[PDB]
Design a protein around this motif. Sequence first.
Motif, PDB file in Angstrom:
ATOM      1  N   UNK A   1       0.831  -1.198   0.000  1.00  0.00           N
ATOM      2  CA  UNK A   1       0.000   0.000   0.000  1.00  0.00           C
ATOM      3  C   UNK A   1       0.866   1.248   0.000  1.00  0.00           C
ATOM      4  N   UNK A   2       0.692   2.073  -1.025  1.00  0.00           N
ATOM      5  CA  UNK A   2       1.296   3.390  -1.113  1.00  0.00           C
ATOM      6  C   UNK A   2       0.194   4.402  -1.387  1.00  0.00           C
ATOM      7  N   UNK A   3       0.572   5.673  -1.397  1.00  0.00           N
ATOM      8  CA  UNK A   3      -0.374   6.737  -1.683  1.00  0.00           C
ATOM      9  C   UNK A   3      -0.611   6.807  -3.186  1.00  0.00           C
ATOM     10  N   UNK A   4      -1.870   6.968  -3.579  1.00  0.00           N
ATOM     11  CA  UNK A   4      -2.235   7.043  -4.985  1.00  0.00           C
ATOM     12  C   UNK A   4      -3.041   8.300  -5.259  1.00  0.00           C
ATOM     13  N   UNK A   5      -2.987   8.748  -6.507  1.00  0.00           N
ATOM     14  CA  UNK A   5      -3.805   9.854  -6.979  1.00  0.00           C
ATOM     15  C   UNK A   5      -4.945   9.299  -7.819  1.00  0.00           C
ATOM     16  N   UNK A   6      -6.164   9.725  -7.512  1.00  0.00           N
ATOM     17  CA  UNK A   6      -7.360   9.209  -8.161  1.00  0.00           C
ATOM     18  C   UNK A   6      -7.783  10.172  -9.258  1.00  0.00           C
ATOM     19  N   UNK A   7      -8.007   9.634 -10.455  1.00  0.00           N
ATOM     20  CA  UNK A   7      -8.489  10.391 -11.598  1.00  0.00           C
ATOM     21  C   UNK A   7      -9.511   9.529 -12.324  1.00  0.00           C
ATOM     22  N   UNK A   8     -10.478  10.174 -12.971  1.00  0.00           N
ATOM     23  CA  UNK A   8     -11.456   9.455 -13.773  1.00  0.00           C
ATOM     24  C   UNK A   8     -10.837   9.063 -15.108  1.00  0.00           C
TER      25      UNK A   8
ATOM     26  N   UNK B   1       6.086   5.283  -7.606  1.00  0.00           N
ATOM     27  CA  UNK B   1       6.663   4.722  -8.820  1.00  0.00           C
ATOM     28  C   UNK B   1       5.881   5.055 -10.082  1.00  0.00           C
ATOM     29  N   UNK B   2       4.757   5.761  -9.967  1.00  0.00           N
ATOM     30  CA  UNK B   2       3.952   6.235 -11.090  1.00  0.00           C
ATOM     31  C   UNK B   2       3.263   5.106 -11.850  1.00  0.00           C
ATOM     32  N   UNK B   3       3.156   3.926 -11.247  1.00  0.00           N
ATOM     33  CA  UNK B   3       2.390   2.841 -11.842  1.00  0.00           C
ATOM     34  C   UNK B   3       0.898   3.100 -11.670  1.00  0.00           C
ATOM     35  N   UNK B   4       0.144   2.944 -12.752  1.00  0.00           N
ATOM     36  CA  UNK B   4      -1.293   3.167 -12.728  1.00  0.00           C
ATOM     37  C   UNK B   4      -2.052   1.870 -12.483  1.00  0.00           C
ATOM     38  N   UNK B   5      -3.231   2.010 -11.886  1.00  0.00           N
ATOM     39  CA  UNK B   5      -4.161   0.912 -11.682  1.00  0.00           C
ATOM     40  C   UNK B   5      -5.559   1.404 -12.018  1.00  0.00           C
ATOM     41  N   UNK B   6      -6.434   0.472 -12.378  1.00  0.00           N
ATOM     42  CA  UNK B   6      -7.785   0.796 -12.809  1.00  0.00           C
ATOM     43  C   UNK B   6      -8.801   0.100 -11.916  1.00  0.00           C
ATOM     44  N   UNK B   7      -9.826   0.843 -11.504  1.00  0.00           N
ATOM     45  CA  UNK B   7     -10.907   0.298 -10.693  1.00  0.00           C
ATOM     46  C   UNK B   7     -12.259   0.744 -11.229  1.00  0.00           C
ATOM     47  N   UNK B   8     -13.105  -0.180 -11.669  1.00  0.00           N
ATOM     48  CA  UNK B   8     -14.462   0.202 -12.067  1.00  0.00           C
ATOM     49  C   UNK B   8     -15.383   0.315 -10.863  1.00  0.00           C
ATOM     50  N   UNK B   9     -16.214   1.347 -10.875  1.00  0.00           N
ATOM     51  CA  UNK B   9     -17.254   1.527  -9.877  1.00  0.00           C
ATOM     52  C   UNK B   9     -18.602   1.117 -10.457  1.00  0.00           C
ATOM     53  N   UNK B  10     -19.606   1.063  -9.589  1.00  0.00           N
ATOM     54  CA  UNK B  10     -20.946   0.720 -10.029  1.00  0.00           C
ATOM     55  C   UNK B  10     -21.514   1.842 -10.897  1.00  0.00           C
ATOM     56  N   UNK B  11     -22.698   1.602 -11.447  1.00  0.00           N
ATOM     57  CA  UNK B  11     -23.331   2.570 -12.331  1.00  0.00           C
ATOM     58  C   UNK B  11     -23.883   3.724 -11.507  1.00  0.00           C
TER      59      UNK B  11
END
Lengths: 292, 103, 144, 208, 159
Positions: free
Chosen positions: B19-26, B76-86
């Motif tokens: 677990x590290x700190x992440x920046x959330x973007x759409x 490390x600037x690695x991106x991850x993707x998470x889908x949310x509900x509708x």
Amino acid sequence: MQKEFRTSAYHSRFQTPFRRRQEGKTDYYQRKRLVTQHKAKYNSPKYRLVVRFTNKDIIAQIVSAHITGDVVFTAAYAHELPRYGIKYGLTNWSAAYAVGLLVARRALQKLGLDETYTGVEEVEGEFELTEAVEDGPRPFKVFLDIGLQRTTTGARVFGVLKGASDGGLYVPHSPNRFPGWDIEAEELDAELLRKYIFGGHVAEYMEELLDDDEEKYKSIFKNYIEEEIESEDVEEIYANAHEAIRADPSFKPTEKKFTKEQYKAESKKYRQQKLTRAERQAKVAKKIAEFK
Amino acid sequence: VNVPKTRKTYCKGKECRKHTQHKVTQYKAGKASLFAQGKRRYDRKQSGYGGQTKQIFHKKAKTTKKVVLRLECVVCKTKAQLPLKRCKHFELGGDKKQKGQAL
Amino acid sequence: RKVLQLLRLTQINAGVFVRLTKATSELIKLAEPYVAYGYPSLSTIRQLVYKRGFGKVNKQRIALSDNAIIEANLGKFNILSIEDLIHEIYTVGPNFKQVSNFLWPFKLSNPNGGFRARKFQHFIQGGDTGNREQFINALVKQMN
Amino acid sequence: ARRPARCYRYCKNKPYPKSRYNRAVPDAKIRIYDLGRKKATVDEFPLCIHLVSNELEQLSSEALEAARICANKYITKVSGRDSFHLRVRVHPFHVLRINKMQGMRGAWGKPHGLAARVSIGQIIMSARTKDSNKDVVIEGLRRARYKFPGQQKIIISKKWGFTPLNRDEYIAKKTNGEVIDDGAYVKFLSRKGNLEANLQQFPNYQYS
Amino acid sequence: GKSRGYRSGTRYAFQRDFKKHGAIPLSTYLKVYKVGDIVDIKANGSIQKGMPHKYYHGKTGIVYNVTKSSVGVIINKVVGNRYIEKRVNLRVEHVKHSACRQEFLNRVKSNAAKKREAKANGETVYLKRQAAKPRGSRIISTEGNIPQTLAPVAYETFI
RNA sequence: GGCAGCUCUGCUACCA
RNA sequence: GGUUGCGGCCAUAUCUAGCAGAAAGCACCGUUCCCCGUUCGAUCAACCGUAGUUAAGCUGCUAAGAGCAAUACCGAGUAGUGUAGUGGGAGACCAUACGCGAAACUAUUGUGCUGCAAUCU
RNA sequence: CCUAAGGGGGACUCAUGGAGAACAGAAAUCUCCAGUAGAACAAAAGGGUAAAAGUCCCCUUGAUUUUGAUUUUCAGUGUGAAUACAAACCAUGAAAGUGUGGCCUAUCGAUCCUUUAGUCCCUCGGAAUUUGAGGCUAGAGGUGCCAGAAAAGUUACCACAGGGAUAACUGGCUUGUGGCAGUCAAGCGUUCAUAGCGACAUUGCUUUUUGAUUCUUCGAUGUCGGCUCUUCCUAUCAUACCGAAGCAGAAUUCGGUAAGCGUUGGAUUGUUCACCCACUAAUAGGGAACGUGAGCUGGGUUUAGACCGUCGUGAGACAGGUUAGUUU
RNA sequence: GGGUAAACGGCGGGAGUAACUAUGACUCUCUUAAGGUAGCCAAAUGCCUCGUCAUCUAAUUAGUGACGCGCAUGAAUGGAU
RNA sequence: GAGGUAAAGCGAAUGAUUAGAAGUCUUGGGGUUGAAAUGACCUUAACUUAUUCUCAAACUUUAAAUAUGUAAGAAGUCCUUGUUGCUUAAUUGAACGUGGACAAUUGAAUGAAGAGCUUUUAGUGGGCCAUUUUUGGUAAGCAGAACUGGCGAUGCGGGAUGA
Ligand SMILES: [Mg+2]
Ligand SMILES: [Mg+2]
Ligand SMILES: [Mg+2]
Ligand SMILES: [Mg+2]
Ligand SMILES: [Mg+2]
Ligand SMILES: [Mg+2]
Ligand SMILES: [Mg+2]
Ligand SMILES: [Mg+2]
Ligand SMILES: [Mg+2]
Ligand SMILES: [Mg+2]
Ligand SMILES: [Mg+2]
Ligand SMILES: [Mg+2]
Ligand SMILES: [Mg+2]
Ligand SMILES: [Mg+2]
Ligand SMILES: [Mg+2]
Ligand SMILES: [Mg+2]
Ligand SMILES: [Mg+2]
Ligand SMILES: [Mg+2]
Ligand SMILES: [Mg+2]
Ligand SMILES: [Mg+2]
Ligand SMILES: [Mg+2]
Ligand SMILES: [Mg+2]
Ligand SMILES: [Mg+2]
Ligand SMILES: [Mg+2]
Ligand SMILES: [Mg+2]
Ligand SMILES: [Mg+2]
Ligand SMILES: [Mg+2]
Ligand SMILES: [Mg+2]
Ligand SMILES: [Mg+2]
Ligand SMILES: [Mg+2]
Ligand SMILES: [Mg+2]
Ligand SMILES: [Mg+2]
Ligand SMILES: [Mg+2]
Ligand SMILES: [Mg+2]
Ligand SMILES: [Mg+2]
Ligand SMILES: [Mg+2]
Ligand SMILES: [Mg+2]
Ligand SMILES: [Mg+2]
Ligand SMILES: [Mg+2]
Ligand SMILES: [Mg+2]
Ligand SMILES: [Mg+2]
Ligand SMILES: [Mg+2]
Ligand SMILES: [Mg+2]
Ligand SMILES: [Mg+2]
Ligand SMILES: [Mg+2]
Ligand SMILES: [Mg+2]
Ligand SMILES: [Mg+2]
Ligand SMILES: [Mg+2]
Ligand SMILES: [Mg+2]
Ligand SMILES: [Mg+2]
Ligand SMILES: [Mg+2]
Ligand SMILES: [Mg+2]
Ligand SMILES: [Mg+2]
Ligand SMILES: [Mg+2]
Ligand SMILES: [Mg+2]
Ligand SMILES: [Mg+2]
Ligand SMILES: [Mg+2]
Ligand SMILES: [Mg+2]
Ligand SMILES: [Mg+2]
Ligand SMILES: [Mg+2]
Ligand SMILES: [Mg+2]
Ligand SMILES: [Mg+2]
Ligand SMILES: [Mg+2]
Ligand SMILES: [Mg+2]
Ligand SMILES: [Mg+2]
Ligand SMILES: [Mg+2]
Ligand SMILES: [Mg+2]
Ligand SMILES: [Mg+2]
Ligand SMILES: [Mg+2]
Ligand SMILES: [Zn+2]
């Protein structure tokens, strides 16, 4: 004008809580979380450090739960402390530490883990957990059960916690509830904790009160006055007791002035007995007759 | 739906593995390239005579979309993707709820 | 249907011997609307075994025309004669199971004299099904 | 408006009462179930006569109203309005449905009326009166029987009025101080509960 | 519109018993389940995790897996013309030891004890259970019990 | 979904 | 036998109104320097066991007590029901045969038992 | 729908009632007592929950990562949803523990294509570099006809394969509805329930109404009405003989046996039905494949021509009106 | 942005009101691109409907003449003769 | 073991519901007291208390019959002690074992033209009827379900005739 509430239907449909919940003594939520064991550790029990405070006593028991009822492994009470050299303040935070140390040493004696897992022999107030010895049996693991007593930083239950941990038992805990924990600067001031372990707060109250309110000092600290115990020699009372507690932690039951049968016979004299069916029937008949 | 602009989740990057700190973007879908093979094939098929050669979807039924969060690790600037509900409404880092106030 | 199959009653006018216990009584209660039963006397058992007695030998229906047939199949159960078999059935013996299962189900004829006006109602209500208890002997005399 | 009663005679459907699930239900035609001198005490009317059902059947609220009116009219005309207490013992709680008021598609009906579902031996109407008024009250019920479908019997009760005690057990409990008035009904003595309250409520209780 | 959700039709099956709602008595959490134990399945409505499907409510099976808070139970369910082995994960609140084991395991001990004694006495004993047999003959004494004659009673109305 | 003007009108575009 | 701590079953343990309680325990009770928490040291925290009290809590007993529990020549082999007939009846429904079999009601009895540890006139 | 309404921990107890406190009152706020939940828990309903799952406070992101097993629907396929673990990494708590979204049961989506993330790995095949492209693993963009074509009408000019699996007649079951007939008897009838009627109810019959159904017929049973002719039914309009009356006579009304015998001429309408005029003893009601078209006729309906009105952008529709339309 | 209907076409509702009543010349109100003008009519166009009145007959759902809030008449989608 | 249908219940919760009686109105009006005192009285209506008549597919404390899950051993039971990186404070357990003992009453009945296993392929995928349970409908030779048995696919004796 309003409906009477305590109807027979109210009593018929009432579901009484558990007997020990209606007494207000057992938190069954916490009890379920404490007692329940991993199902793949089949008959291995979880051991609880039950710590209870009365107005006059500190009760510390090591308990495992079974279907027929809880089973005590060892038990140390605060009224055992006079045997070890602590006669007054049997509910200090320091008395709590002494009771925890006593129950830890007694349990380890019962198990055989005395020479291994001695504990913190030089109490400096540092936070420490009993670490296992390589190529040897793991330390006796015990979980703290404070019951309904509130969790506050400085509470006496964590005095028994610290004593039992220093006595060689492995009791998982954190140092943020000990006296001397700075919540803003998240570190433990071990000097103040060591002060609390050896009655430092009580000794400082004795010293601070003696030069300000001598009359209250005479009533509050009477036993110390007739025992010629000043503040500067308060610490040794605990410091020696620890050593004495480690020298012979075995349980010595109080010699009983009477036998079980004598106690039972004496107590049975002051116990009212239920009326026979015929007795209350005769009472009802008499009450009817005196009504004409 | 209100989602904070930062988040501490697991980082799959080999450097982090924690677990590290992440920046959330759409997440926003990229522009369709003209040199994608399926695009190249479609243009060749559409050329000449014959009209429309592939089907065109009409019977739209969804009124929302699944929002995807782009989580970029600050280490490390690695991106991850998470889908949310509708959700019909989605803001990033909006004003948090304040409970205990009047209208 | 399953109960009648387990009693080896798979045709009309088929007869079998059953040792009464709780289990077999509760079996027979299920088949009651389709069977007539009762308590057989010694002479009825003897007449049944003598005239229509057959044995199950290698899953074949063999007439009990010689005591060697009975002995070769029931000598390990101490049955050496047709009278040993009749005794073992009548006084329900320790080897009743083997002796009664060795007996092929009896294939009786229709009654000489007929049934009552309507068979398929209990014997108590003027029919033929159920337990008639000593009148099974008269019925067997009609049918054997 | 109303179909012939033969369309709704039999208890073919499950009970269909008013509830949160059917709400637009009309009212029953019968609203009054107690007639005559309904305030009379238990000791005034010892004789009870029942109209008893010999049918598992449905009776419309209209039939209940008609029979009630017929019996009341006859008995008040012959013996006076205060010579009896008539009680109708069945309440129409079952809702009948009508369909026409396409074809069989969507044929679930609308509420149409109310009916009481009665069993065999069920009491339909009870009349407490004096003994000398027997033949009148019977003739009051025998006419009301004409308003009902099916078979009904007029049965003279073994009991005192509307009480559950026989005409002899009631007299025994009455001369023993175990019965007190409660308006039109009575309260019986209990050998359970607070002894003092029991004694106070029944002062004439000759205890044994 | 038909509705066939997971807990459809469980209005009364998953209800708590009357005057028995609330916390679970802790003997439920103190029981020990081993692989091979026979357990009854009865869903507790107040614990929604590890809950069985309504089919397994009232079924009995074999424990095959033991986890932190749950047991795996093997159930045989009829699907058409055969049985299918079903493997259900159940929290121990929905599980109870089957009382049919403890009775049969006692008959095994009793048979072993009876057999060894008969060998010691050099005699025989029969261990097979027997169905109830028709009762034997008996003599009924009539001293103080002379037969009382009953008759059918006439018809009366009691209303 | 692109332009552009006045929360938006007009034009243009359309393989899941 | 009493009492405490931890319990198992979870009212035969609950509820209402009275009365009694030796010993110890428990409890109420006293104080605010200290750790701690509050509008409020009332609750929570700490200190003394010192100044007081069995008033309350707690425990037991009482009540043709409410409730609860159990039992039954109680009701009732009733209601219901599996199986059967070319049974009755226009029907609604009913009887009979071989089986299973309630609930309410009524009456009576009872009103926690118990495991581990410690302690006590 | 929700950054909390998710997760952990802690503290508290809810609906409501009673008794009290300036303005203050039925409803403001405070206090005590009672309070098994009569509250609340996003949203249907059901279940669940009291030192909580409810209310408030503190800290947080486990609504994370990897890929298997299992339950439901089930073909034991997919999708959705859920369960118990393994290996990580975390949150929370003194701790035991709990947490893999929402207390549980609904809240959702393949191939092809596109796009993003990951691995920065494999390939572009004469050998390389750098762009570009293509692969591998995981999401997203969507199919609601929700196991997922890309899709407007009309035909009264019509066609074909079929269907009595299916409508428009008769017939059959039913009889709600239509029609007819009883029982009871509150009232009407100067009085007087029943001469004649008869409410509130209730039991029937009929198949001369219309429904309901879809069993027969779609390799066709000629679908309106009238004319003509025969016969049958009776619930009898007349005629024969009679009983009853609130039957003086005359007339009339109620009823019985009775279908032997009769039951008409016309104006308007295609009409069945209707409505008048008039005669008459009376101008009763029905059935016979809603009798009867190789008996007729053909006015109506319902082929193709044409007009109007309303509707439609239009082709066209109208169960609306109108005129002409092969009867073997 | 403008023009154009002998282009396709279109051409409104709700209440009050006159020394009886009825009606509504008049007024108020919503609203359109415009709100059916001159004419004509139960007409081959009107459902209700066999409209109402008159005439024709002994009697007329037919005919003709009137009437008109006209389901849904109307002006070269030509109106009336 | 499981169940919540039949029945039952409603002076038991929820909902519906008939009738009086006794109390309180102090937080209901009318009338009559009151010169005015809200401080009584007659009344109806409210509530409260103990009763009373009748009910529920989407109510319920209770609760069948029929149907339904599991078990009734040799792959079992007992004794001793081997393995592991799992588990325990442990020399504790978990799982799988070596060695030894218990022999046909080896652990209920009845039956068993034997049990087990595999491959491959046809037709079918309009159904209908009877008893009982049951939904819609006034009902139907109507429409729709449950269990079983039948017809279809089936002749034969009886029901005159008839799937
Ligand atoms: Mg806690
Ligand atoms: Mg080209
Ligand atoms: Mg092309
Ligand atoms: Mg081109
Ligand atoms: Mg002969
Ligand atoms: Mg015969
Ligand atoms: Mg029905
Ligand atoms: Mg249709
Ligand atoms: Mg249950
Ligand atoms: Mg969950
Ligand atoms: Mg939260
Ligand atoms: Mg929540
Ligand atoms: Mg909490
Ligand atoms: Mg699956
Ligand atoms: Mg699945
Ligand atoms: Mg789904
Ligand atoms: Mg942790
Ligand atoms: Mg975890
Ligand atoms: Mg691609
Ligand atoms: Mg290559
Ligand atoms: Mg190349
Ligand atoms: Mg997708
Ligand atoms: Mg698409
Ligand atoms: Mg589809
Ligand atoms: Mg589909
Ligand atoms: Mg076309
Ligand atoms: Mg057409
Ligand atoms: Mg057909
Ligand atoms: Mg009819
Ligand atoms: Mg009819
Ligand atoms: Mg009719
Ligand atoms: Mg009169
Ligand atoms: Mg037809
Ligand atoms: Mg045809
Ligand atoms: Mg012909
Ligand atoms: Mg022909
Ligand atoms: Mg006649
Ligand atoms: Mg006549
Ligand atoms: Mg004739
Ligand atoms: Mg004409
Ligand atoms: Mg006809
Ligand atoms: Mg015809
Ligand atoms: Mg002809
Ligand atoms: Mg012709
Ligand atoms: Mg023509
Ligand atoms: Mg034409
Ligand atoms: Mg037009
Ligand atoms: Mg011509
Ligand atoms: Mg004009
Ligand atoms: Mg006109
Ligand atoms: Mg015209
Ligand atoms: Mg003419
Ligand atoms: Mg005319
Ligand atoms: Mg004209
Ligand atoms: Mg026009
Ligand atoms: Mg013009
Ligand atoms: Mg025109
Ligand atoms: Mg029920
Ligand atoms: Mg159910
Ligand atoms: Mg019932
Ligand atoms: Mg009951
Ligand atoms: Mg009730
Ligand atoms: Mg095939
Ligand atoms: Mg196939
Ligand atoms: Mg079909
Ligand atoms: Mg066929
Ligand atoms: Mg046959
Ligand atoms: Mg024949
Ligand atoms: Mg016949
Ligand atoms: Zn990273």
